[model samples]
Target: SCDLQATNYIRGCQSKTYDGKIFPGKGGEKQWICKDTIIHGDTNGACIPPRTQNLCVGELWDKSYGGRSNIKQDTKELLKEKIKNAIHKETELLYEYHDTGTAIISKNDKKGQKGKNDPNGLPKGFCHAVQRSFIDYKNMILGTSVNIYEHIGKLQEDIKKIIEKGTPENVNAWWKGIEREMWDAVRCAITKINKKNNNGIFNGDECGVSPPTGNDEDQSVSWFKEWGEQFCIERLRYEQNIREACTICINSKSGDKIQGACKRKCEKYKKYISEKKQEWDKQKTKYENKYVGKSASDLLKENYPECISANFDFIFNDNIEYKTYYPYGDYSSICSCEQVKYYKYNNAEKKNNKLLCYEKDNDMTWSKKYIKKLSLEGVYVPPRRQQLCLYELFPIIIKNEEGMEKAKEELLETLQIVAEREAYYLWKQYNPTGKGIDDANKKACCAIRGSFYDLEDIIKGNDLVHDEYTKYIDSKLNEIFGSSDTNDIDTKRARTDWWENEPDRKTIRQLVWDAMQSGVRYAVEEKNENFPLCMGVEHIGIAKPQFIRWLEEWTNEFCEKYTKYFEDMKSKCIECKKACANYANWLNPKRIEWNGMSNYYNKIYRKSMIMAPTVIDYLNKRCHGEINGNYICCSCKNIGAYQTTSGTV
Candidate 1:
């Protein structure tokens, strides 16, 4: 009964503040301990003489429960016929937002007034705060899916549950039990969106914090118990980040992922050309001339193999050059010996500078262009500078007619004008027009530019809502190749046409199992960018360009339907094609065992038709990674699908 008449009006109020009081003081020790009642004994209890109690606690708890509408109008007409037979149909879900011609109210809220949940009057919290502020301003202006990018982390968990510890008398019955657990998760997400009609999960409306003014009954019960301690700490951080991003987007659309591609590496580019050809044959026989001598007695003649290492020429330093210099020059930049020294690189002596070598006319207002390779001794360089800005010295001249032909083609500088039309008539003699427009500052500048051009034409159609999601994946790949059963390689290897290749994408795990069969939906708690662009064709260089020719003709008809049905079933079993070419040449099974047909004809009949080249080499590498494309890369952060952070290498 309104919790013991709100605990006997806080034990019959001894002025212990009301607005934010839970149970502050004075019930005079429960009204003198309910008049010291000596329960069984009429023993003339002396303490009972202190105050008043005469046990009368029930009735008077009607805080408008009598005004009705707290359910029971036949349970609000059986919860409006169980929310229209629990969302029977109309999921027309037509969100067409980019409307912005300009009608999103709030110039002090257009209309809708009355209160206490609009008692037959409309507009109390203006039609539920304009349908929860137009579905949180169109999921925050059409970023449409990452379940509203966890609304800045559930507005920092409702600023730590309405600034900590939620109590305006149990935050309106804890948001009416979070609107009855979001209407039993919108009646199991509309019974799984009427049994899977474009999956479900749409119980969207959430955001709160209103009553800043208006019939703010005690500031709407202290902003509804500080927004119910920020709705029990942002509904437990939106149910642990929409259940760990809906279980990593339903385990990456179930392929469990780890696929790979990106080629062109050929054994690490052939070990970088054999370590630059063994560092040019070990800097060639280490600077050659081994003092050969037919003189000093002919015995020292061992330097022959093309005599004294024949191939000549040396220098090596001042820009290197040994023997073979040009046409694909090697001899390691022509080998000059003393181990080729050169030095310089600390950003090449920091770009050897003083404003890129500036000595313009040495009376020296500044220097310019000097360090031409630091006169070859090779180093001591330092001087970079650059950093220019202020529009590189006041550049904006725009005078129209293309700024009078760029001020007669750059013959510019009319500098000294200094607004001197006689100092503009002596600066208009100490300012003239100083006071005016005070009709409350011109209606507060037209009430701060009214609808503010419908928030800049709904933010200039946010790049036309991703160009209408790429024209809705080219009209859902022309409505699945116009209802394709196309060249039927067994109904294109049917896993229901290999999972209806995105007849327009839709999958945050089928919208979290159609928001639990549309039981009115709610649960995707956070991390949203509209939950990764409504679970974009599962990422990696994003494709769905109309399910790229129906997943490249269902991976080339599922690798030519089991590679021509296991090579015409081992060429119609010529003894199971010599027992699957003796199990594709891994022979044994007792060398085709009894030589006729037993041993399950070479272990399970030609090793399942030699496992048809391992099922046509995994359906020809999954139809060449679905025609040179793979997915799941959104910088992956460890979950499924590996590589592929980019396509086209």
Candidate 2:
């Protein structure tokens, strides 16, 4: 009925347009009509002919459907059941996908012919969408599992009470209320889950944008889609098992039992590692095929011809030695270089004049005493007017037309590729057993996930690495060239001269050089820092402290249990050889004695304590104490005691 009304309204409006009307001035041609249009008569209402068919549409098409079509009521039970079922079913599907492989909708085609049979084809980012939902569901359950169960339990309880005690009419209304509450709760939960990935392909409102079509594009997309799902599936499987193992360990009572559980889980993880290894091999092959017969050296030679033959010292950037020299060995004494005047262009006056080297100094104006102190302490000091080889080289490489600029770019790109492979190989080597984390192998565990997923960001460009390197180089350059402002200069001429070498005005080659060197050094430094593989054990490190606390707690609990057991045995039988023997070994008591003077006055004075038999020796001697000067050991009274008195002179 609603459809019928919609159709009639659309057709009825269509007839009111130009095609439904003709005017005399228009010569039987249709006339365009609008509120602004001047029709057949300027001063009167211009009429369009009424339609021959009744286009009012069917009985106003009441969407209420006799009020039985109330969605809030009709969909209440259905919505509740559907949402509850989906949460569990979708979660099960995620786990199944990990082991059983994906359910691909269909093969791709130009006309989308494969999608004809099943119109709801698999959407792009389907794996990520499902993953997001799974994570949300897991977290929600973790936080409120008991609450959800209680909420549902309350609805059931109310429904049962109403059914048993109330009239049919009253019972129906009560049941309806229960259904509404259940629906609302489920709907809220579903809404929460969907928000985890608002544009999720599987369950959310929007699917991702379609990939470009045609054979070449489609083939690549198909390849990537297969591998991406494979990678994510295996990763999810590994993560799931790791979490479960950890859960068991947490709930376990005995250390021995937890260790056994961990060992079993470790075996299961080995399977996941094997699967990952295969995936990695396949991906690596694809990479090799794409970059076949290409070498970084060849690329470098082409881009940086000048640097081709140059033996570039990669280590010079961070490790350069700086030693300052002072010719005069005292403060206030001027060096020959400082006193020697050289003819140079005075940029302020635009004239050539003799300039002393000492005039070029700022707060860097160090005396011989300070220089000598620094030298004595093994600190490097720069000679006044002496140019640094490394600093000078920066200007040469950067200021030149074809130099480190091209070379640095090429080097960085090559290093990224190398690092990716290095990371993969390391992961394979270390993570195969999957016992790395349980065994506290932090370095190996971290290698499992490198700087990026499959190191894709590394191969392309990672903003994290780039931004850090940029800041580090900028700071280093500032340290080298002096960070003083032009206003700090003593005179107007010096200020003008300083401004001449400022960043904006790079007429001075040295300034241009320093700026360029900053960028170049950043690239090179990043390559060095990340080349072998970029990863961190911070996540593994974080877990160690928690683990240590857990161990301490467990140890204390065990100790308490053991003490209770020990005391119980002793109370039961004080003469129990096993208990007493264990107690002796645990406490490990020893014996000692002191000697008295033999003479009358001297007898009152006691000698210092002497070495005596241990508990072990006392027990071994059949309880007979050591005998000396008719005195038996009184500490453990296995022998009869004797009284002592002061000796007479």
Candidate 3:
């Protein structure tokens, strides 16, 4: 049995270190005692494993500190600094210091005053700070490159040549010549942090001031997954250990030889697999966290910060070439000096000149080229989350034992709240034509209307769109309720109720729409952009009521124009619509409209009614999937039924 305790019977009298009091020293000793009973006796078995023959400096350090697992944070940092300082201090004054290896060989240099029985006792050990320095000069040269990084340039390469298969006779001259050249360049690069020479690290006035996200893909998910793969391979050694140790049971020779081996292996594998599973679990969560809950928009910005407009908006010109840490740097790419300058100075003290680099995430930066190329393909996430929120409340409400009217009211309220929230998000994320967009900007600055949700219905069946929204809802719950679970009905209800009833949401709702309206007019006036459907309002208008009137008119005309395509959908057999309703959206295009644009969009429109609810009854009613002649009584998917919930005909 194992003693699960801080102080219990996993003990024995162990060999101990001695100071060697006599000239030959007292040496070490071993004693016998059952620490479990604290009595001198031999145990039935060894109390603990004996110490290994070999020990290293790290082992001594850990033992000297009485184990470092729970050491204080300050002491941990203290140890690191002390070790580096010791290494650096010796390295700095190292012409004569031999690297082949040496040691301080400590011993108490005491001579007895009056022989072995002296009253004064033996002379105490000699005074000590450092008894003697035995340097390992050879190993010291290996660190020369890293040492150079401490001052300027980068790490890694500085020591490569010395350690590499080079032909240099005197390595000292090689390092000296390189050092002199760099020192001279340093004179050329000399400039205040408040200002720097036009020169830079990698090139003339063009060194990257900060790392670039320029066209880089998010390697995070893949990196984690790869480790998951690598560590799977790594854990096999441990797996092998468990197999061999536990496999030495009475195999076919014992009474139930194989059975014993089997049982032993089972238990052994259980422990081994679990330990290894955690390594794999780590990889799974990393992959899942990104693909599952991370928003389409989140991936969008991170895919390339340069794709967002602001990455290019940094103020650097031809004069001050931006520079970043060169060589062996990772994550993104070289960023504009003006970009870093803005953080240091832009919002810091423009009037007084404080140039404080501001704190920002990698997602916040981007150049125009990246944005323009991928903008058309970018995602609008709010509607996905909108669908998510509605799905949460609608399922339980529809199956309730309560009467139809009650369910209707619940679904209706849920839809409106989700609609408001989604619209709120959509408008807020819209990056206008010319502003420096940050992570906040989701609009791709393309000609297409990124929001409008009207066009999203065109791809209902294919858009599996699951992970990010579930992730979004979960995140929203944790942040708002400070509770992590999405499983609790009460928590889901709390989230739904908050979106519907929160006063701040109301205020933001108004603010977002107002800005949206303003942008509408500005786009029309400046870019000559026209709403696809006639808005029946001025190019630039002020009345808030008129905007709502404008929206109704615009949405009405847009849907009105598409009625033919949708109404035409009624002629198709019920399988197309019914199969889509069941979330079997992968139905082939030949089976589902693969080629004809009109049929494709109309087909998606039919399915989307079941997915997204709106205040407009006609859109939902018209899409209530048509059946083959004479089976009205047994239809599978019905959007018209949902219309009743909203009190629409």
Candidate 4:
């Protein structure tokens, strides 16, 4: 298995210089060599040299204990002065040779000869020349085009004013002028760059790069006119067509307009405004007619509620808080009657025989009254399963047997106490110091058996309620009193009476251990087993209230020790050790294992030790980091070779 933290240290029977020992050599003369030091092709590669150069000679000479120099003053100080002058002299020298090419060749060298005047050797000083040409090209473009942007800015402002005041023809001409101005700017910039490169021997193409073909037709300015010009032309046509229509109508009515000429002239202008309004109204009415006075159902029937408001307040009573509660195997019926009325009224409109709004409102009012009545009695709505169980059992519990009233009262008190204790236990399981249920604890409590009786059987008892009542009572007595072929009733009754009356820690501990073991065994045997085993019976056999009581006691007493037992079992298993190592590797990004072998080994470990997923998780939490045992070093065991710096095993 892959281990994330495990190191692979290479080991072999070779020696390093650091790991060797020193020995005496030659007659009374000692050598620094050691036995077992690795032999190398070069001594420098194998061992450190006895003599090495000092990084700074001045400091080394001053610090050395050798005899003083023949000169009285310090020679090291004099050497430092000379070194500083040499560095300055090196920096001051200048030459005109290419830095981008091979070693410096003097410009004065003879053509085909080796003398200093040779200028025929393919002059290699082109680095600065190429750099200068590019610099000049950029500068020429920048210098010539700075005014183009200022010219375009003024042109755009002039066009904006013309659009508000000029005729369509004038505006069309102005757009043309703007396009021409911007196109000239781009064309002029390109021409200057090309002109600068034209004077070179290679004409920009050979030394630096290629040339640009001067084309300006598809420039940005050409497309810029299309947007504004189309809108201007359309507006021009609309205003002109309306004015022309008004003139034709006035001319056609000229014969009748002889009387009241001034009124007719004033009325013509009114006619023009009215014509524009009528044209706009034609389009507006067409759009509005589709939704005005439309019912939601009319649209919803067509699979589109085109007029419905998106807000929730338009549908149901926003004042009522919507709380989700479990059905508990029976209908809790949190559905809103108002929501139902809206759906029903809308559906009625889709049928085309719907009552008027007021009539439906009255109907909804009556319907709600009826629904409230039904909700009040369990008969009107399906009852909660807990309510159903109490309904079935309470009558029998209160029936007049010997001292039955007193016993029923005691049972009620016990039931309330158990409920309170269950609530406390669940809270402590999740919150510890706080109060209330978390989702997980609530889910676990709901799974407990015999808390809420099955709705199907309880409802089936409608025709035989008395019979079920007697039977349930008999079973409860038999359970608590233990009167059957199964065990001695007197002995069991005595014990049950003691538990019911005195209820102490030891009795509860025993009960918790038995129930815990039973749950563990049942979970282990059936996990990933064959289908339809009806594991529901395992939960149903143990009473929820009683189990909670037992669990509370067990957690207080032996929970940690029981958890450790499983942990120790896993730690001792060799397969589990490999599985955990792989699990760690799977978590590490640098040493990830994608194969499912780790999970497979975990499954094997779980099954072999009778541990389910939840049980294993509990063990892990209690074990902390104690699962490091049973792991064997593969290299040490000779099962595999390890990678190390020296060499492979």
Candidate 5:
């Protein structure tokens, strides 16, 4: 009786086939739209490929897991074998990083240091700080998976015990136990990767933070936790399915009838397990093949693979044999290739900046020979030589360190240059429909983020970092304003306000500073045009030519994976206005007693007032914000409109 009662829950991005299998990306793509806070039907065509989750909590699901190795048909014993292997493999990596990073004296060392394992055996310098944090947090990341392997081990062992005991009550606890462990592991991961306030809920809130930094454990955790609720639910299903088959076969009192029941009853499920296992196997192979026993830096290269990417030890602050790998490899001008154009977005006067291709100069700036429309067709720009240095253009500047006086003057300035340059070229590739890097900027991305992430405390401090940045930014704006000024009142006001506002400051400052540094880096590097701005990078060793490709890959990887992360969220906010309006009518003060004392009124009142026109004009439109701050524009807050003592946006 092979009935279709137990069917495949084939989740996908598009319509189902006539035979009822889920298939994605069909025709009439743009006809779809969200409505009434629910997905409306009669929508047609291919989707932009909905984001999918990593398969499981095992090491196999790790980004560095070598799936590109040889494979064979999936089997249960083989899967178990792989799990044990992954456990051992990750363990070795964890120890290797800890020992090497802290410079644990090895028996082979002929130097003054010979023995190992004392905690104080830690090497001197800021570099060890990097290794310690990376090693600790790595355990938080990979240790969870290895611990997870133990959970699975417990699962199978207890399963054997139950079958051997053949007790009827054996059914109740294993699934429950495994799920609790799964949930615990999932929460631990979520804690490791996100802000503590961030729950396991994905796609709905700012649960995810930017990438790891070892600044503190909170900031140091990597933003790569893709398997939270989804993986938990998936693993639970497989666990439950196995238990049910066992239960069903065990309960059949007729001995002859019992054995064959599961053989056929779970036959389809057995194949399903094999198929799903194969899918996970297939996912790992998605990686480019690597040489066996690659170094940590090699893995990082795989992770951040771009010329102008983060310096070798830029993450968690240190790297291999204690010397940073290609410290000056941070020079590269690269761009991604994606389809382009859509939507004019907000600037003070709502400048029509489209896919970084067709950008309107702000009325205030009347910005030079602004490209009204940039060509989608790629044209090769001739490569030029650039001497760089062993200094990481972006180093692992910790949360501590009176924090680099140079970071304010040099690092921030150059990163802004690269962020600006990369974002422009990147936008040219992917049409984020005007501020497109917004799906967390999905499958692909860079720029603005790196500068902002590092600018974390640098922007917060009111000392030299802030005051000096403020001075340079102000002076430059004053100089540029004279040339770019439309000379009109509002245009002038808008131009000045753009620099004045913090939300706009980083951007405008970066944009103008990019121009300033663009000239300065070259002026000193070639013509010896030395000045205060061109301080240390002089006579710097030039970077490798492959840096361009590396930078491109880095930008693409970041944005591609995260850029398109929030469209579903966008749709909700898009459809939220009308849906909220319906609720607002009933909750209207006129309809209900509102003296601000009622709990329900108090709870939703703040939201209702804030969201009323926000969803209608601000959120849904996604652009055309007023210079005035009432709506709290999604792009940025109106710094001027806020209460002075209320603190910063």
Candidate 6:
């Protein structure tokens, strides 16, 4: 672990001084000065100067203790004047006698005292504070250019004009220009940084901040379900508490006359009755305590205890005012029919059609199409397995438990034989010029079909919706059923992703709606038919209410707007490509100015940001400081290295 700990001192502070490197002296003591080194020049030449004009002294000598000459008229006033002049003279003379770096080193001799074992003892070692100095410097150069590689000044000007127009119509057009500059800077930086090093370290870290419902398509549906359950539980608890308190209040008003309808049985009216009852109990307790002494008989006191046990207060003659309490603001209307209707609509969409019935062993669970559909949306999570999606194995698991159990079991046994044949075929594919099976084929079989569930699914039907599952099945089948050697799983490497970029918001909404409706239907039908749903609504209740609202609104309006947005994007892409081609032609001596837009599109657009592809491209270019979806150093990852520091004289 890179995690370090500290006892008496911080790790950084300790390591900074002790662990790296420091010089030690002779006999474990360090020397102070070299024989000849420059520190700073002494200000005056002390030994060469006359006594009156010595200039290198640090301070002048005081003359009060010394006798003065008779010719100097040693009066008290004259004494003070001579002493002041002497002080000024010596102040200039001290530094000349005591040199700094080189002078101190030249006189590095010590007077001896007593030695450890010598018959004639002597003082030997010495210590000195030498002033040593050196220069520390940092050289850093920063530069910027006008993107000489690609001039975007004209585009920026156009965008500024569109933005200044300030009409709703020009907003998207201005955004298109901004996106171009972003990609222009990013594409240049990536190429430059990649060329600068061979260790493959990216110059910048990609920090991606993922959206909560972004990955899971059916989040709204699941959130809605969870919210409903919580609301029901909290509401019940609230009503129960209110009812108990109201009962206590009513019991206090035993023999009160029935008030008129308007004034009867209100929570406010019960309060006055409760206060009077409490006062009567307090007075009765005071009266009892006045009669009993400490020496009174135990049996007599037990029989007539003044303060009765607090627990025995349940004897109000059934004449108190009482009323019901309910959490919904009104007990008469607790209808959740709209919620139920939404749930029903979801369930009806998931029933199995005539084409596929691989409902696993449990028919009460979801249909194959429904499972595949929901699995892709990533809404269904497996219990206890953090970060693992239920969708991956769901299709296979459904097959295992559905109508194919016998076929699945027999298929597993056959797969062992199939594995042997497949291994041989894999050898031929990788070693086309040779004939024997290699370790690669054995390893592939061990990893890919290591789990029996995967093998059984392969022998029966396909998971047509998922690309990974289909490719996995296809790889194994080619080894056993075809004449491929070393079954290259890389065959589908050429498959281009159609939806690699961020889809329009409408496309995402449609995908979510499809998933929610399927999940809801599954939950409802299973419950209605007495099929065991999860005991406390874990699956169906996870979707949030807000998401469902978005789905409903998107479905009503997306079709009418998306095509126009796509057409505008297409025009921008085309124009950017044409401009790049014109620039390229100016650079290329071989290409004529008359080259058609087809060649321009084929060459230049393919390299431009417009062609580089995806919303990620645009986001990377435009939003440099904004959060992108990436794993941050969460609190769990930050292992205890925190501190603060301050300085004082």
lDDT, candidate 4, at 416: 32
In model 1, how large is the Cα lDDT of residue 272? 32
State the C-alpha lDDT per candidate.
0.22, 0.27, 0.26, 0.25, 0.27, 0.23
lDDT of 2 by residue, 1-649 (tens): 0111111122112211112222222222232111122221220111111110111111111123221111122233443343344433343333233222122211122233322122222332333334334333222222222211112223333334434454344444543354333223222332333344556333322222321223212222223333344334333344344445543333244222234544455445444443434433444344335546442222222332222222112211112121122111111011111221111222254321111111222223211111121112211221221111112222222212232334333322322333333333333333332333333223332332322221222112211121112222222223333335633223334322332343243332232223222322333344353211222211111112211222222222223334554676678683588776765443321100111111211222222313544322322342243211111111223221121211111
TM-score for each prediction? 0.13, 0.18, 0.22, 0.13, 0.23, 0.15
Off by over 4 Å in 6: 1-177, 193-471, 485-649
lDDT score for residue 544 of model 3:
27
lDDT of model 3, residue 165:
37
Best of the two (5, 6) by TM-score: 5
lDDT of 5 by residue, 1-649 (tens): 1111111221221221211122232332221111111222211111111111111223223223322211123343433333333322222222333334221212122223344333332222112222222333233232122221212323333334433354332333433233332223222332222232345232211211322234323211121111111222233333334334533333344232224444443444334433333322322232222223223233322332121122222222223322223211111110001111111212245211211211212111110111112321111111110101112223212111132343234434443443333334332333232332233222112222222222221222111121212323322333333334465454355444543343333453434334333333333334342323211221212222221222222222222222232333345564766655654443342122212122222243345365434212322243223211111123323221221222212
lDDT agreement of model 5 with the native? 0.27
Q: Identify the candidate with maximal TM-score.
A: 5
- Candidate 5 error regions (>4 Å): 1-400, 423-614, 617-649
User: How many clashes in candidate 4?
Assistant: 8
Give per-residue CA lDDT, model 3, range 1-649, as digits (tens): 1111211111111211211122333544321111223221222221211011111112102322323311122232333332233322322111111111111112111321322121211111101101111111122222321111112111123334322434443444443333332222222221111132233222211211221122222333322322322233223333344344432334344232324443443445345443434433333444445466433233333432222211111211111211122110110111101111111112354421111112212222111111112112222222222222222222223122233444433433333333333333333233342233331122221111222222122111112132322322233333444344554556555543433243233422233233333333434444454432222222222222211222222232223323433344554435557634432322221122212322323343445366633334433443344321111111113343332232212
Q: Per-residue alpha-carbon lDDT of model 6 for 1-649, expressed as tens digits?
A: 1111111121111111101122231122222111222221121111100111211111112113331122122333332233222222222112122222122111221222122111111111001000000000000001111211122223233333434444343434433333333222222222233344475443311211111122112211122222222223223333333333332211124332223321232323234224323422332243235334221122122222221111111111112211111111121111111110112222455332111111112112111121233213312211111111122122222122222334233333223323322322322222232222332222222221211122223333222222222333343333333334433332222111111111235321122223333332343344352211211122222222221222222211222222333344466674667655653433242122112211332343344355454322322333233111111101111111110010001
Give the Å error, residue 410, model 5: 3.2
lDDT of 2 at 420: 32
Off by over 4 Å in 2: 1-221, 247-258, 292-649
